Symmetry: D3
Subunit: 271 residues, 6 copies
């Protein structure tokens, strides 16, 4: 199992830029070509994101074309910036097991040593995350029927406050409902999130919980500053690889930079 | 508790640059000035690194002056690029609780909600890691006499393989001995490492185990390719904050970039 | 009184770039978000500029949206690149006291310790500036009724030759008419200009007269080279602050760059 | 008269960088080579700066070699970062008319339409400025015996507060004494300063008073915040040219940037 | 004779980017303004290229406008990415002696000491080059009627394999037909090519044969790696100048960079 | 045969930078590490350069260490910036076949399909080139006794004028004497040069004659202007590969840039 995990693409419509000056569409197209030019090729790509920025049809058309151009199976989930109906109309073809019901988009993947669970944490008319009871019970079923085989969950919103002044108020509001499932199921060992536009990580019993940086713009972590900052600090994504009995996630830079060069002992310490 | 955690500074001597072209001294001086310019100030700074590149006294002279100019208490531990004797001679004044015996540099910090444990995994005459009999025992003593209070360990070498073709053969060789301690002690919940020059992370039981990017050069993760690559992709460090009952870690970029701007609802989605 | 003073935006139509390669629209949107993310917030924003590049309706639509997104009262004036009618049709809403007559767009602001005077120096069918007699007499009235209270004037074209080979021929052709008002009114102490895409400054009796750099592209100052150069050297704007009895203007960079860091005496001079 | 006016070079010794990471020596060497490569060549170069950072002899050795390699007559004055004695020992050969007495370095230049006055506002053992009794008197002597010929003064410290939270408490403390001279002498019309590392400008009577950006690092203007910031925003200098009866000053960027291209009417507005 | 020789523009339609992220249209517009802002002005511009990327009408419209804005006579030839019919419909006006027949676009220029020959190496429905028999015989005629006067030929595809793993398979498939003409005609001394997006050069008897870098993206030379790489390494073009009896071609960078500065013997070797 | 051919390294001594601001030592160290990191490894590295800038022993010390760290056999020849005696003392251990006599450094390489000829065109006390009587004779001896086997010559100075206002008066003064050898010997087919810091190329008979860019700074080609310019436009080198019967040379960028990505038919032309 090799997974390329990106999120918060925030696509705009043809010939628009985010905020009028950040070319999300180009940046993402770069990321796509970057991903499908990797030497060690992932088995699938996950997008946990706010796939589009405003939830408009023209935005999903760009998203469909650019994400369509990836040369991998995709697993896609909505965010607060998404519109459930339109997400399903445009993207369901790229991720068929999302289903047929916009209000219950979720699915399980049983192809690898660790089962993958994809869920919708987004709620209409708010930025905050909400886990619906049908989501929770589907989860309970999945985790029970799965037994010992470990599980990871992908969702847009972080299930608990992370001390981020800007991001916490708009976290998953009833995140306790998932936290409780980690108490029930020792098998559930990873939860991965978007929304924070940051690599922030934590542990709750067996579960490693982490948010991801965005593919384009990032938001910094402030503890007592309320200001809605965002910046163009380096974009990054997460690779997930099954390494024997371990799930290992490593950051893979999406920035363009110098190198690589080879390490050489003489060049390292001249005499 | 706010911790600024950098690693793998790899200082060279006054004249010199890493490999002849990477100006580590400048980059670290920048990192230092960056750190002590933060609005939200950490309580201390951790450096888990190969503090110097060649284990030379003139490198420690530079490291002492530059790390010395941080306006924070420091916790410093060595790596395989360090020299036990010289590390102690030059850096012990900047971290007195390391002790007096260069072969058993260690200390516990008890000031915050989570106990901090600093150890030396470096072994003279090899790049690979080793936990000395006395270290393992001191580690187990800390957890045994510590009770419910959670513990995090800082060590240079990762205590398990991570699937990194380059970095795995030179991990901590008796790492399973520390993994044994996490199985036995439910209160050991973070292990943080240098060595890998990358953010790779995994959970074993309750423990979140993660390596850090370097302050300067990075090494990419390859599964198949053993070519000893390094590159100049973006440097970051890890901030550790206590958030009620959670230890949360977030990546703080040390690159220079555009931003920040403020998020504006109307600019985000114009009509 | 804090004023953010930018000019020569040179907006193009939706999905055009200036000269086909300079993205003025993105650059300006950046500037806007930059301005309305300032920590010390100005009382208003002045645009002395060639607001659009070709004087086309589609250009004013972009200008209206982007300048509209600023979170400040705006004071806007035309330039040679503008079209008076269309300027008034699209932008008058953002700056109501321009008036109702495209041929006599001007206004006074009596909110601060120094009265502000906004005038139209642009003339149809030419690049050169022209001050119409009705402009001059309105000015005389304003300056007389104002008495001792100091005044500053904002206009597109510099009232006198500045020794700039390219820019002088297309300066304000009858700039003597304003120069004469500075001789009459000791109260008139600042004149600020666009057009030159440069920070070039001078003094005439009590009056400090200066042109501003552009928000995007700049034109260098040459004394005997006729060539119509322009470059992408760093963009900048002017802040005007009333400091007791002084009007102080300082340059505020619009470039993205490294820092800031804090000055430290030990880091400054090590021992 | 063409003057190239740079300031605040802040040289460090041969090995070293400002604060450990800003390569002032390189940046100034670049600035120097840049200056003596200009197509339109200045008649002389003014340096109003803190020529060196720590007031050390080995810094003056560097400053001497680098400023020495300018192919222009130089006028150099000290700042609070300079050492009177050493400034004279090392730099007086590059500016002979400074004199022989390190406590009264001063000179008038009478070659152009405007008299040039160079003075030393620096005071041993403080960052703030001071005009010595003999300076003030020599200043008044120059203007008194000078008649109608206009005068400009070059000094390190600004002679009045400018609203800069950082830079104001360390302005020229008896600056009002020079302001007294501008009230009495209508021919004193420019005062130019270093210290602030910024282009801020104001008029007092006939005098245009302006500070300059540094050749390397800059300090931003804050009204409220006293945090001693500096940054690496774009460096520029000021060119001073006599244009008939006007002294005009224009900002010359020292950054490296794209351009120039030529303006083409058809490319500007395609059909 | 001064010739500015660019190729492989790869224009996209209005508001598209190559691969969704490389702004070929802006990059080329930059190149155009760059070319027609040269101090030493060429006599004509040659484009050997894949002028457009997909062969679509909307693409030729952008190409027509941007190349139209050059202030020089153009000599234009098709590539594999072009569509012969549409190329002739849109671009023939900018290069009238291409002719009237899309299937036989070629021409000779007898204005300079060396005669220039422009030919179509592109073949419909393939990437590979093909020289048609009518092309070859037109060439034979031209070379015979020309006698001693030297000749250079411009074509899209390189007439022989260059050892480039990616590019060789899609070279000019019957390139032997031209190689044979160089054996027959000692007068034929330069052959210049696009297609390879690289400066790769070779000699066959009297003939110097070279490919050109692209104006935007480049493809690296690999000898046994099949992967279809491309990169954004620096773009460049070729200048051809008749220097007495010699045809000299020099690379002229299209990248933006620092300098120039003037060489100075003292600055070079200080004492 | 794969050759990596760099030129004009211009090393300075340990402390120092070229002209005070260009860090040639770092740039060359980078180039070196870059070279010995190539996937397709050259059989040897040619350096035709002014290996050092001032002809100083401490510069050769640096050059020795840095060129010494290449993991390839080296062929080194001097330029006008070199010192014959010191070049031999310091670099002959890295290229033993240069000989023992500093006034007649030369050698033939016979290992590949094409004979390689390395010579010294540098002349003590001038920047211009000279072929010593014994050189010309040794050259003619090699070609005479060599038969059909093709030959390439590496020399610092270009053997004919190229129309470069700056570089022509300082070409190889008796260059016509080598041109005489190409007329007489049809097997002399490549001549490669440094000196010009540019890729300019021409053919004389069967010989392709080309100069190389420098590893660091470049000098632009002007026909009319003699101002001694240099700039920091992109550095590259030349790879020489034997491809059956063809010697092919391709430019390898040494800059750091975005890419590579893979070409995808569908991404190239979306529907
Ligand atoms: Zn979100
Ligand atoms: Zn988001
Ligand atoms: Zn290590
Ligand atoms: Zn390390
Ligand atoms: Zn204008
Ligand atoms: Zn303008
Ligand atoms: Zn100062
Ligand atoms: Zn200063
Ligand atoms: Zn092609
Ligand atoms: Zn092409
Ligand atoms: Zn040379
Ligand atoms: Zn050279």
């Amino acid at each position: 199992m090799l997974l390329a995990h990106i999120s918060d693409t925030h696509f705009r419509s043809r010939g628009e830029k985010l905020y009028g000056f950040i070319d999300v569409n180009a940046a993402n197209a770069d990321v796509v070509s970057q991903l499908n030019a990797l030497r060690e090729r992932p088995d699938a790509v996950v997008v946990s994101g706010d796939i589009v920025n405003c939830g408009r049809p023209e935005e999903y058309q760009v998203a469909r074309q650019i994400l369509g151009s990836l040369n991998y199976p995709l697993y896609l989930i909505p965010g607060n910036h998404d519109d459930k109906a339109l997400f399903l109309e445009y993207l369901q073809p790229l991720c068929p097991q999302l289903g047929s019901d916009a209000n219950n988009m979720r699915c399980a993947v049983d192809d690898f040593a660790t089962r993958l669970l994809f869920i919708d944490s987004s709620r209409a008319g708010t930025s905050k995350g909400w886990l619906t009871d049908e989501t929770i019970s589907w989860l309970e079923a999945q985790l029970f029927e799965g037994g010992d085989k470990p599980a990871t969950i992908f969702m847009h919103h972080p299930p608990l406050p992370l001390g981020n002044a800007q991001m916490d108020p708009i976290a998953c509001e009833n995140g306790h409902r998932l936290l409780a499932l980690v108490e029930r199921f020792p098998s559930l060992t990873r939860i991965f999130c978007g929304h924070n536009h940051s690599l922030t990580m934590t542990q709750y019993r067996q579960a490693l919980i982490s948010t991801l940086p965005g593919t384009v713009h990032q938001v910094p972590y402030c503890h007592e500053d309320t200001d809605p900052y965002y910046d163009l600090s380096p974009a990054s994504c997460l690779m997930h690889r099954q390494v024997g009995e371990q799930w290992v996630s490593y950051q893979h830079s999406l920035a363009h930079y110098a190198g690589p060069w080879l390490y050489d002992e003489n060049i390292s310490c001249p005499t």
